[PDB]
Amino acid sequence: VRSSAGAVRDAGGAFGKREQAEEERYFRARAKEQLAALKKHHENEIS
Amino acid sequence: TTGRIVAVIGAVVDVQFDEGLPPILNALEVQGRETRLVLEVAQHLGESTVRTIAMDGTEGLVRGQKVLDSGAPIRIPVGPETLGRIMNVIGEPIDERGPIKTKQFAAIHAEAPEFVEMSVEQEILVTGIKVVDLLAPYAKGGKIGLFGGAGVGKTVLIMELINNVAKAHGGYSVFAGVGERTREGNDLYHEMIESGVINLKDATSKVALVYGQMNEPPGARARVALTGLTVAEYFRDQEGQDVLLFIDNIFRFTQAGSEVSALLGRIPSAVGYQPTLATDMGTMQERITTTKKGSITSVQAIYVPADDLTDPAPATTFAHLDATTVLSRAIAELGIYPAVDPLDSTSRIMDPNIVGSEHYDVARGVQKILQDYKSLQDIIAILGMDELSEEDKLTVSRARKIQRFLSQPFQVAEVFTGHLGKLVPLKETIKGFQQILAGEYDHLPEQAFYMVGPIEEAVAKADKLAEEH
Amino acid sequence: FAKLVRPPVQIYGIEGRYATALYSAASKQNKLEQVEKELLRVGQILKEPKMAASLLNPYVKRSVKVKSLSDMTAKEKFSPLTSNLINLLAENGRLTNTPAVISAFSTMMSVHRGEVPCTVTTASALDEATLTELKTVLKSFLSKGQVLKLEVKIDPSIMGGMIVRIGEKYVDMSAKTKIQKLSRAMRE
Amino acid sequence: KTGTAEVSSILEERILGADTSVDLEETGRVLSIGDGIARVHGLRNVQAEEMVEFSSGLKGMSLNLEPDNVGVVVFGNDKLIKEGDIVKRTGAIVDVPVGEELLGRVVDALGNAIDGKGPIGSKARRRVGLKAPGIIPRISVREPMQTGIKAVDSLVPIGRGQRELIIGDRQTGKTSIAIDTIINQKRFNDGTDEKKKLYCIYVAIGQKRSTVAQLVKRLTDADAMKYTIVVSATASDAAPLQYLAPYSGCSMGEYFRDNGKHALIIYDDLSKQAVAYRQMSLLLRRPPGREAYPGDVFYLHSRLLERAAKMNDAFGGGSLTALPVIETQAGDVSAYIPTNVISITDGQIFLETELFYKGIRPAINVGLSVSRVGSAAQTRAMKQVAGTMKLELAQYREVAAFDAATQQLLSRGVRLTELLKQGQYSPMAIEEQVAVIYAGVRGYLDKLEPSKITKFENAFLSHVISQHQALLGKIRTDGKISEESDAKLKEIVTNFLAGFE
Amino acid sequence: VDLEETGRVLSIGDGIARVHGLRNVQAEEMVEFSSGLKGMSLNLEPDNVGVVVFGNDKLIKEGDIVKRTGAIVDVPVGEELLGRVVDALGNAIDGKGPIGSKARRRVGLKAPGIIPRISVREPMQTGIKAVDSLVPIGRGQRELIIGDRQTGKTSIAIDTIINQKRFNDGTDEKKKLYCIYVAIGQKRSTVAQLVKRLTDADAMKYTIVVSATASDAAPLQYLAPYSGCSMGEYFRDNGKHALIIYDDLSKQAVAYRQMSLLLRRPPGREAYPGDVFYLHSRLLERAAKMNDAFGGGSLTALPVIETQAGDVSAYIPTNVISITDGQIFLETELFYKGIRPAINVGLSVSRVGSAAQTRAMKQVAGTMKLELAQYREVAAFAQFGSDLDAATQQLLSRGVRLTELLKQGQYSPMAIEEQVAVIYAGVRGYLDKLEPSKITKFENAFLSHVISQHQALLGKIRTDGKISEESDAKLKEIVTNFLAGF
Ligand SMILES: Nc1ncnc2c1ncn2[C@@H]1O[C@H](COP(=O)(O)OP(=O)(O)OP(=O)(O)O)[C@@H](O)[C@H]1O
Ligand SMILES: Nc1ncnc2c1ncn2[C@@H]1O[C@H](COP(=O)(O)OP(=O)(O)OP(=O)(O)O)[C@@H](O)[C@H]1O
Ligand SMILES: Nc1ncnc2c1ncn2[C@@H]1O[C@H](COP(=O)(O)OP(=O)(O)O)[C@@H](O)[C@H]1O
Ligand SMILES: [Mg+2]
Ligand SMILES: [Mg+2]
Ligand SMILES: [Mg+2]
């Protein structure tokens, strides 16, 4: 047996869930910031 | 000739003859049955005995019944009259509208086109699905496979392909359902009738359904594939026209053979499959082909037992397809639908010469970025994502955006998702993925791309999320 | 099922199983001697080159076999038991091993009348006086009713003495065995 | 190549010309009984899968029709059969009684009452081995079968005519799902809407009789026996009985289906019918396959589950729902028989044995539980609430391993999850389910403590069932939640919330 | 009736006739059925004969008459086959007429002994940088190509076949190499597109495509490799050089397994009979390199194996890995991250080694191998990249460039001198000051530039077969001048 790439997600163990949760956290934060920036740009561009 | 049944064991009936002996593959009619029972010969055991597989339940058979050799293999009606009907494995209709009155009969067993009869042209077949068109483009006249576990999207995807292509097709079509739910067969029949593809009143139907659903004894599930294949063979050769042939499932064609094998007196192979798995499948998959005198755009759903692509059955089928779109359960768990696995679906026309330089560069870029993301997830396991460098957080963000953008809402999935089905022409997909890769959308949230058609719709959805924020 | 009368000696395999069937059939009705006669007559009949070659070809309908055998058993006016047995063998397809069947029956008949077989192996022939006294002594081994059925044999492998077999019992007085026993015992 | 019937006891009959005295057409003699399988010589006119009757009252089913003998399987213990016993035909393919007389009887796999309340007075009999409906008789599953379990009715809706599959490890609550479903239909059956009555059948395959007796007591307690049949082929029963019990139950249900009535049938378990079938096949010397299961153990279940159909209105409009129960070993849902059945059904309820300890009961593992029929078989009000609830749970399930917005999301998800828990043998009407789901999903519990929702729900239900039954009746009859009904629910939820603390 | 030169079918079914008679039939002899069907007599038992039918058993009723042809299986040979498409027995299937070959050979002949051979020393140019530098293949070798699905094995084989066109179009006679491509268990349209592809590159005037496709009966797929190997032994035994490509050898094993399990031979592991080693060993041991006393010819072999899930401990993969002189792993993980051909150079080996490399490619690849070996043991850091000393930083900055030099495109093999020039530029260090993404472009440019102007230097490298210090200096000057203006 050998090691592949991205096998932590495949295994589905605790570590895989920890991946998916942490990544979702980070990109939820960034999506909130990007949505705020999009609204603010919209207001700054109506003018 | 006329023999007499001598033994019945499961679906395997041994019949003894005193006149001449019926060659293998012949069809023998059992005398004294309320409904036509046809036994297909499969062996000559010596002493003028033949082993046979019963195409229909062998309940109520008695040792000594009389059996008449029809004299030729299972013959089925063909012609443009079978369009809009539904047929047994043995050709008799099962939609309760009277007999299929044709001039042409065809034997379901026939040799495959010789090597001197094959075509060598390949032209992409736009399907309107982003992932399929981008990473594993289909081809007109080619054989196509949908490898799925259970409940991943094989049937919804093949219904989407029917709706898309069969409706916009100049030629005819055929849907041979081999050993899958009868609920689905009825659903498809009614969907076609209500969508105009089938027409009960007049002769304007473009589909010739054939059904061997999973309540048929194994002798029947192992042959309805050949029956649908015979109808498509006729439309390819005699009509001299393009044809479509959807098969769902093509695993059951192997499973049924495995079911009867042991009783046929054969030592089992690797995983309980019959020793003749490879050839019993080649002799079938070698008739589903384009030739100089026609063209068949066969699509086939393929069960992958327990999501094990190394199983003998899918492993053997992989070599008989010009394009495979491996649906995956892991992607379907993320909610991406269709679940097509971008790093496992391949094709034979994915070349810079056949699809063009830019299409090829974009497809390879998508694959490479997704693979890089797969590698990075391992590090994100331990570090967390705040620790990732700034050239990789970009890679992860872009890869997530591309994963979402590969999803799409189909017109046959409105019942589940509620959204509206979309078709994305090839240019829209290539342009959208070019832009996502280039970085022209780092300012939109990833969820902006989830279940949208062209890229402009992702922009509009991002704007709507921002406004409603 | 019926209570088939057990034959004296038990044989096994298909041969001995047909033979047991026939023996139990004949024993009822007390037709053993005549049944054996018709059996040893079919033994000669089936060796006929035409029949021998016809019955070994598997490409003649088994019904042809049965019809031919019915003809050849009606011509000889065989007892109904033997005709039925031969028809049975033809139906089942075992007539290819008929000589094993009838032979078994012969054995199963010998043990009936007490022909306890024997065998003597020597390095040379035996003078009729010596052979006769040998028979007289061997007769002492048996029981009442039984009668010796001697079978002389010659082999050069054993040098001296001889080897005697009386049904199951077996005594090896060869010089070979004695030489081996002496050599082993003295070496060990 | 020694034939079985080439014994001496037979060749002797043949030799001395005595076979003509006995009947070898409608009668035979047991060559060899052993381990529950008889070989019979004779019966030249016995049909395949026909029933035969031994000379001691025991019955059997002639499975193997070999050239010279017949492999019969005894529906009982072969302690009483002896070499040479006379087996006499019965003339008819094995069939079982059916009717409304069976309702409320603990019948046996073969249709013989084992509750001791007297003979079944049935009139008609059906062959167990009948073909399932075709493409034409059926129609799309449209009506809802109310399970009475919040999670199932909300996120895994089950229609009438649909074959679900309750799959999970041992001791995770599959029979509990089945019995909640059986008990729930009590409200519909005790009513006048004859088109909503559902008649239940429980097939107990390879379960100790104590279990079946406790289950029957539980059903009688809720007086859910006047409309229930129980086909009981328990562990002590010969393998052929355990192999035939599902087909007896399925035919008893095909009766109600073919007469415009709606039936539900629950096989428990099918993984033990498969074991009984394997034993039968191996004792008939049929070659094994995977794990020794006969080569055709898929067809065995496919031909059984394909009979759960939903007939069109030209065929009476009847219906037969099936709820097979499979038992995986260690969550290894990728085994042989679980995989065989997972692709035969349309939907599956995944009982996970670690959701079961972490607190979630019933253990339904949403996200892995699917219903291919889907929202098409749901009530409009439940559609409305479930549309939001399923989505919110889907989002919360990817941020469970832990901001303000996402913190609110997790809070709401935990609120919903505590709302999906349930008692046992206490199903709820659809109106109450939608009421509490609405209360929890609009946000009227975003502040209440988690450990209190478990009680709040309970209390809340009582309040409505004691104060605003008119609203529930309106929601139920109207089917959908009307705007005035929505406002009434809003008022009621806020009022109870304020006065609950 | 004759039951020595003739017999009659007792039974048939699943392609295994059981014949009665044929008392004088030899084992592995070709009998003929009354229906114009041939067959091979494999099981000689006391009572019958087990004939495997070369075709469909629909035409073989019970009671048929079978007549022995008196000869072991044999196939045509010669240069009359070149450019044709024959089936597992020499019958043409390209519809260009009769093959017209005078000679014949037995498929089951034995390999050359211990003395006839001589150590593999010539280089068999595959035209692929990765193969030709890091896992070289000599003439007379047996280099397994083992991989997963759709990783690029058939493409390695076809690039090898296409490359030989430069040698076969020249006048040097001991560099000419004739290719044979045995295609076992492949959809016919695949073979048709392959023949078209070979015609496009004009590489079909010295190629013999032996076709045993999926529809063909099991015996034809079991027999195709031996037919091809005999047509190749013909060129070996006449002072010519051959290259036979079995594709795959796993499907020959599957066909053989079907034959055995239907003849009822003891199964064994994975149901493979006990001869799936003997089967392949007595095939791959016919790739030799005869010494001058025997002509000097040679016969390379490139068996292709598919491994399920990269499992190379399965039965057949290990059987064929313990028989061959190397292996070229083709991992898909590398395939999708840009590395195409996806030749995993850690697992790939060649027990022949650099004994079969031209002196120039030895001179360069000797150090390239070490550079990549050093890179492969600090590859993990690549992500972190910073935070590490200049030592590992330079290691994995050289490794990335070297890796990106080994990328190559469909059907475009490179002449040995051009590979040497590119690897020289890359490894001597004239690229470490370049952004990795541009490396490929540089290559695709530099190559062309060198091809246009400095053809004389390439000719000198090709002929001398070595990088003389004069040529070394001239090449350094060329690289420096070009890299300056980029
Ligand atoms: N919703 C629930 N709440 C609390 N307990 C439950 C619930 N459902 C099931 N249980 C508990 O699970 C136990 C066994 O469950 P059940 O017998 O229904 O599962 P099962 O898998 O059918 O068991 P087996 O497979 O052994 O027959 C019961 O004693 C019951 O207390
Ligand atoms: N050197 C390469 N550069 C770019 N693409 C390649 C290269 N080699 C192979 N490919 C691509 O990989 C795909 C599969 O190639 P190939 O047919 O050689 O693999 P295979 O192992 O033969 O497939 P199968 O196992 O199905 O026969 C092809 O579409 C081809 O475009
Ligand atoms: N495109 C899609 N959009 C939303 N849901 C889907 C989609 N495809 C499949 N699904 C869900 O996955 C399930 C898979 O069922 P289906 O694909 O019909 O059968 P199969 O097991 O043959 O794949 C469907 O019932 C559906 O709920
Ligand atoms: Mg499906
Ligand atoms: Mg239980
Ligand atoms: Mg290939």
Q: What are the DSSP calls for B299-343, one per residue?
A: EEEEE-GGG-TTSHHHHHHGGG-SEE--B-HHHHHTT-SS-B-TT
Chains E and D touch (3+ CB pairs under 8 A): no
Distance CA E88, CA E193 (A): 19
Question: Which residues partner with B175 through β-bridges?
Answer: B209, B246
A27 inside 8 A of chain B by CB: yes
Q: Which atom of ligand 2 lies closest to the CA of E158?
A: 18
Distance of residue B116 Cα from the nearest chain D Cα, in angstroms:
40
The interaxial angle of helices B455-468 and A14-46, nearest 10 deg, is 80
Total count of domains within chain B: 3
Mutate to test the pocket of ligand 3, among B333, B411, B416, B417 (most ligand atoms within 8 A of CB): B416
B113, B282, B379 member nearest E383 (Cβ): B379
SS3 D387: helix
B79 and B68 housed in the same domain: no
**Which two tokens mark B75?**
């013959």
B291 and B336 housed in the same domain: yes
Of B3, B33, B89, B255, the closest CA to residue D48 belongs to B33
* CB < 8 Å to E264, chain B: 267
A21, A29, A32 member nearest D402 (Cβ): A21
Of B19, B51, B73, which one is at a domain's C-terminal end?
B73
Q: Among this protein's residues, is B181 annotated catalytic? A: yes
B67 and B192 housed in the same domain: no
Count other Cβ atoms within 10 Å, centred on residue D2: 9
End-to-end CA distance of chain A: 63
B425 and B337 housed in the same domain: no
Query: How deeply is C103 buried, as exposed, middle or buried, from its count of CB atoms within 10 A (0-12, 13-18, 19+)?
Result: middle
**Which two tokens mark B41?**
């010969």
Q: Is D32 annotated as a binding residue?
A: no
Sheet holding C169-172, edge to edge: C152-154, C118-122, C162-166, C169-172
For chains B and C, CB pairs below 8 A equal 7
Residue ranges making up the domain that contains B356:
350-469
* CB < 8 Å to C59, chain B: none
* CB < 8 Å to B143, chain E: 187
- In this complex, the chains that touch A, judged by 3 or more CB pairs closer than 8 A, are B, D, E
Write b or e for each residue in B237-247: b if 16 or more Cβ atoms lie within 10 A of its Cβ, otherwise e: eeeeebbbbbb
B445 inside 8 A of chain D by CB: no
Distance CA B433, CA B455 (A): 8
For chains A and B, CB pairs below 8 A equal 61
B190 and B202 housed in the same domain: yes
**Which two tokens mark D74?**
């005894």
Distance CA E484, CA E477 (A): 11
Of B285, B315, B349, which one is at a domain's C-terminal end?
B349
**Which two tokens mark E118?**
């001589």
Pairing status of strand B2-9 against strand D86-93: unpaired
Please confirm whether the linkage preceding E387 is cis (ω < 30° from 0).
no
Indicate which technique resolved this structure.
Answer: cryo-EM
Binary contact (C93, B47; C-beta < 8 A): yes
C92 inside 8 A of chain B by CB: no
* E410 ligand 2 Cβ < 6 A: yes
Alpha helices in D206-287 (DSSP H): 209-221, 239-258, 270-283
* E126 ligand 2 Cβ < 6 A: no
C169 inside 8 A of chain B by CB: no
Q: Which atom of ligand 2 lies closest to the CA of E157?
A: 18
Q: Which atom of ligand 2 lies closest to the CA of E409?
A: 3
Distance CA B85, CA B435 (A): 47
Strands (E) across E143-189 are located at 144-147, 177-184
Count other Cβ atoms within 10 Å, centred on residue C135: 13
Binary contact (B446, A31; C-beta < 8 A): yes
The secondary structure of A1-47 as a DSSP string is ----SSHHHHH-SHHHHHHHHHHHHHHHHHHHHHHHHHHHHHHHHH-
Question: Which residues partner with B177 through β-bridges?
Answer: B211
Cα B299 to the center of its chain, rounded Å: 5
* Domains in chain E: boundaries: 2-71, 72-357, 358-486
Q: Which atom of ligand 2 lies closest to the CA of B319?
A: 26
**Which two tokens mark D340?**
């065989």
A8 inside 8 A of chain B by CB: yes
Residue ranges making up the domain that contains A38:
1-47
Which one of D2, D11, D40, D41 makes the best mutation probe of the C interface by having the most chain C beta carbons within 10 Å? D11
| Sequence-separated (6 or more) residues with CB below 8 Å from residue E456 | none
Total count of domains within chain A: 1
Q: Among this protein's residues, is B180 annotated catalytic? A: yes
B279 inside 8 A of chain E by CB: yes
Give the closest residue (by CA) to ligand 3 atom 26: D372
CB D399 within 8 A of CB A28: yes
Q: Is E472 annotated as a binding residue?
A: no
The secondary structure of D357-377 as a DSSP string is TTT-SS-B-BTTBB-TTGGGG
Exposure on the CB side of residue E186, measured as CA atoms within 13 A: 26
Distance CA E338, CA E235 (A): 39
Q: For tokens 């999850």, name the residue.
A: D417
* E408 ligand 2 Cβ < 6 A: yes
Of C67, C52, C102, C64, the closest CA to residue C82 belongs to C102
* CB < 8 Å to E310, chain A: 2
Query: How deeply is E136 buried, as exposed, middle or buried, from its count of CB atoms within 10 A (0-12, 13-18, 19+)?
Result: buried
The secondary structure of B215-240 as a DSSP string is TS-HHHHTTHHHHHHHHHHHHHHTS-
B1 inside 8 A of chain E by CB: no
Binary contact (E257, B275; C-beta < 8 A): yes
Question: Quick one: which H or E segment has residue B451?
Answer: none
Annotated catalytic residue within B40, B180, B216, B233? B180
Distance CA B97, CA B146 (A): 33
Backbone angles phi, psi at D225, to 5 degrees: -105, -20
Distance CA E84, CA E206 (A): 9
Exposure on the CB side of residue B76, measured as CA atoms within 13 A: 31
Which one of E383, E435, E444 makes the best mutation probe of the B interface by having the most chain B beta carbons within 10 Å? E383
Q: How far is CA E301 from CA B172, E124, E240, E304, E401, in A?
A: 47, 11, 15, 10, 32
Binary contact (D403, A20; C-beta < 8 A): no
Distance CA C160, CA C175 (A): 4
CA of D362 to the centre of ligand 5 (A): 14
CA of D104 to the centre of ligand 5 (A): 20
CA of E153 to the centre of ligand 6 (A): 6
B425 and B454 housed in the same domain: yes
CA of B350 to the centre of ligand 4 (A): 28
Q: What is the DSSP letter of D119?
A: -
Of B338, B333, B306, B150, the closest CA to residue D367 belongs to B333
Binary contact (E337, B51; C-beta < 8 A): no
- In this complex, the chains that touch C, judged by 3 or more CB pairs closer than 8 A, are B, D, E
Q: For tokens 């049929």, name the residue.
A: D286
Give the closest residue (by CA) to ligand 1 atom 9: D173
Which one of B16, B45, B48, B49 makes the best mutation probe of the C interface by having the most chain C beta carbons within 10 Å? B48
A11 inside 8 A of chain B by CB: no
CB B100 within 8 A of CB B85: yes
